[PDB]
RNA sequence: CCGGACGGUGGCCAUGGAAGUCGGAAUCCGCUAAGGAGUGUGUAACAACUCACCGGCGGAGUAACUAUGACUCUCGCCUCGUCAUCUAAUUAAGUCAAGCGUUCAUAGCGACAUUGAUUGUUCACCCACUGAACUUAGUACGAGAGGAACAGUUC
């Protein structure tokens, strides 16, 4: 039915600054910067103070307005990607065979290497995408761990590695061999 | 080929389509084999399917013991006579065609060999390897 | 058995079928592996493992001289030669057990041993002993192939 | 998003055992903000979950047996036949959802209703073969029974 206006709130810290022109986004904080191109979408970004930014959608549809909460939510995780930060961790999981993953390099490369998933006779590889550093979580067994300013690098660093670890011609209910996302979170602690 | 056999094998010749009759080497009581199937063969409009050193076939015993002819069974042909060649470059071939009765799994229902048998075969089927004298 | 040759006597324990008595003796059937048959893998792992230098062991009686190897990751090597040799005195030193007359390993590894002549010095019963060095490995299912099932 | 979900009592009869939750009706009482003689998940059987509802957010008869029919009475189609014999071998689409599915309508199904032999052989019917084999592995899962693959190898 076409609304008039909706627009939304995106709140900002004392760390940061982002800077918007055309509909590209600068976020500048203490972890270093994240920048995002939102050509691709139509809404209206308007400061009122340091501290506080908007985004408004005129005479929007149903499709439209729903991308207007999607455009603060991008910009909301850049922001706290630029403060807080982002770790995803991951466990392996096995029933028999020891799943051993290492970190290599052929040309400045990192990849994520797994070695004997389920026996498996191939040697897979992930490539660590940019932005994202990895530990093997120091007293705790079979955990990895990605961290980073990009949630989306990240996130889809993290599902890369465990879709490289689906199992095939088997029951995948009786054979849960993997290496699964465990817990989504911060970088900075307390919080 | 299939059961039993552990090993590959390398092409060689066929020599025996359905229909030939190898002499029986074994003493099991069968004086002849009568091809009627070679197995792990292929399909083309109007091939015949044929068998070689090696090769396990399904046979009827044309000629022998009573108890053995009127059935089809599984038989390794043994000596083959169509002139085939190794990888050590040797076109060979023996006198006669012959194989041995054999079970699905590869063994021998006698229990000597009469005559030589060619190593390809030796080499597939172990029981045929222990009832062998003179091989190749 | 009825007595039998030498030759034909071994070759028919190595199948693990008797045909007169028609029983298999063994449920499966010894093979080695071909080297073939091994899996391929570019081998270093953290660049290789560690390394030894020359070593010396001297008891006063008998003395042990080795040249120094390297070992490297995920690898396996046998040793092999008579007794008295100093195969035992060698993985001591290895194990941090015994002290190198002269040369030295100090490796930050982890090293789990096995001593050859086992006579029992533990109080203590099988069970006890064997969860308090791990247990889930009692879980798993290799474990009860080759150790639980067989001997009960 | 989350907290609370309570006493009469495990209502009553049917009850093998049915304490709200296969079933036959009946729907009350006290509680207090609100809590159904009880929405669905139910261990047999309570629980233990949950949710509603308060809240934080030309035809017949006949039998000391079946069948047949000695007897009395009246005016080669089907067929590729069956048994042998000769062969290894032989004509020589969707809707509705009542139902099944032991517990459950839709996993899997759904009434009603409705939108080389042998032959001219095609066909049909056998005899054989084989994407397969090899290790991966008699492994992982399974009380067993049994049973994988991705990798590599040969056809």
């Given at each position: 039915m076409?609304?008039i ?6 709140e900002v810290?004392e760390?940061?600054?982002?800077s ?5 986004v ?5 972890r270093?910067?994240?920048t995002?191109?939102?050509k691709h979408?139509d ?5 009122v ?11 929007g549809?149903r499709?439209?307005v729903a991308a207007?909460?999607?455009?603060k939510s991008?910009?909301?995780?850049m ?9 995803y961790?991951?466990?392996?999981v096995?029933?028999?065979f020891?799943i051993?993953?290492?970190?290599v ?5 990192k990849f ?8 498996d006779?191939?040697i897979?590889?992930?490539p ?5 550093t990895?530990?093997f979580?120091?007293?705790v ?7 980073g300013?990009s ?5 889809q660093?993290?599902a890369?590695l465990?879709?490289?670890?689906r199992?095939?011609?088997?029951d995948?209910?009786?054979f849960?061999?993997?290496?699964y996302?465990?817990h989504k979170?911060?970088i900075t602690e307390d919080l | 080929?299939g059961?039993?056999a552990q090993?590959t094998?390398?092409?060689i ?5 359905v229909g ?7 003493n099991?009581?069968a004086?002849?084999?009568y091809?009627?199937?070679v197995?792990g063969?292929?399909?083309?409009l109007?091939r015949l ?7 396990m076939?399904?046979?009827?015993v044309?000629?022998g ?7 089809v ?5 043994v000596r083959?006579?169509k002139s085939?060649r190794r990888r050590?470059?040797?076109?060979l071939y023996?006198?006669?065609?012959a194989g041995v ?5 590869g063994?021998?229902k006698?229990?000597?060999i009469?005559?030589?048998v060619g190593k390809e075969?030796?080499d597939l089927?172990?029981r045929?390897?222990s009832?062998?004298?003179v091989?190749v | 058995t ?11 324990f190595?199948?693990?079928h008797?045909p ?5 003796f063994?449920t499966e059937?010894?093979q080695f592996?071909?080297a073939?048959?091994?899996?391929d893998?570019?081998n ?6 560690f390394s030894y ?6 008891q ?10 390297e ?7 046998v040793?092999?030669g ?5 195969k035992t ?7 941090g057990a015994?002290?190198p ?5 100090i490796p930050?590894?982890?090293?789990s041993m096995?001593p050859?002549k086992?006579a029992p ?10 969860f308090?060095?791990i247990?889930?490995?009692?879980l798993?299912?290799?474990f009860?192939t080759?150790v639980v099932?067989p001997?009960?």
């Amino acid at each position: 039915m076409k609304y008039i206006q909706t627009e939304q709130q995106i709140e900002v810290p004392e760390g940061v600054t982002v800077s918007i022109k055309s509909r590209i986004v600068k976020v500048v904080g203490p972890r270093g910067t994240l920048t995002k191109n939102l050509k691709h979408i139509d809404v209206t970004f308007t400061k009122v103070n340091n501290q506080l930014i908007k985004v408004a959608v005129h005479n929007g549809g149903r499709k439209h307005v729903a991308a207007l909460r999607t455009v603060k939510s991008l910009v909301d995780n850049m922001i706290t990607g630029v403060t807080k930060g982002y770790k995803y961790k991951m466990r392996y999981v096995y029933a028999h065979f020891p799943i051993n993953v290492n970190i290599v390099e052929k040309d400045g490369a990192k990849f994520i290497e797994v070695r004997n998933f389920l026996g498996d006779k191939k040697i897979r590889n992930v490539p660590v995408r940019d932005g994202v550093t990895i530990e093997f979580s120091t007293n705790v067994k079979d955990e990895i761990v990605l961290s980073g300013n990009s949630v989306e690098d990240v996130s889809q660093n993290a599902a890369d590695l465990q879709q490289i670890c689906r199992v095939r011609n088997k029951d995948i209910r009786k054979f849960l061999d993997g290496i699964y996302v465990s817990h989504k979170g911060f970088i900075t602690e307390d919080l | 080929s299939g059961n039993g056999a552990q090993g590959t094998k390398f092409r060689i010749s066929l020599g025996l389509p359905v229909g030939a009759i190898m002499n029986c080497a074994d003493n099991s009581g069968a004086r002849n084999l009568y091809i009627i199937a070679v197995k792990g063969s292929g399909s083309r409009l109007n091939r015949l399917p044929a068998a070689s050193l090696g090769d396990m076939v399904m046979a009827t015993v044309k000629k022998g013991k009573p108890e053995l002819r009127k059935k089809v069974m599984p038989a390794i042909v043994v000596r083959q006579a169509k002139s085939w060649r190794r990888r050590d470059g040797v076109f060979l071939y023996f006198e006669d065609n012959a194989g041995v009765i054999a079970n699905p799994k590869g063994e021998m229902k006698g229990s000597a060999i009469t005559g030589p048998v060619g190593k390809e075969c030796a080499d597939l089927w172990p029981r045929v390897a222990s009832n062998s004298g003179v091989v190749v | 058995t009825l007595p039998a040759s030498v030759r034909e006597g071994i070759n028919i324990f190595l199948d693990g079928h008797i045909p007169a008595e028609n029983l298999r003796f063994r449920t499966e059937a010894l093979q080695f592996r071909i080297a073939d048959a091994t899996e391929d893998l570019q081998n270093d792992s953290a660049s290789r493992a560690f390394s030894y230098p020359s070593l010396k062991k001297t008891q006063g009686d008998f003395v042990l001289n080795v040249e120094e190897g390297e070992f490297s990751d995920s690898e396996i090597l046998v040793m092999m030669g008579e007794n008295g040799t100093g195969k035992t005195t060698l993985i001591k030193l290895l194990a941090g057990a015994l002290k190198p007359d002269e040369g030295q390993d100090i490796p930050k590894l982890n090293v789990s041993m096995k001593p050859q002549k086992i006579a029992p010095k533990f109080p203590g019963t099988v069970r006890q002993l064997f969860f308090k060095k791990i247990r889930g490995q009692f879980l798993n299912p290799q474990f009860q192939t080759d150790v639980v099932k067989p001997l009960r």
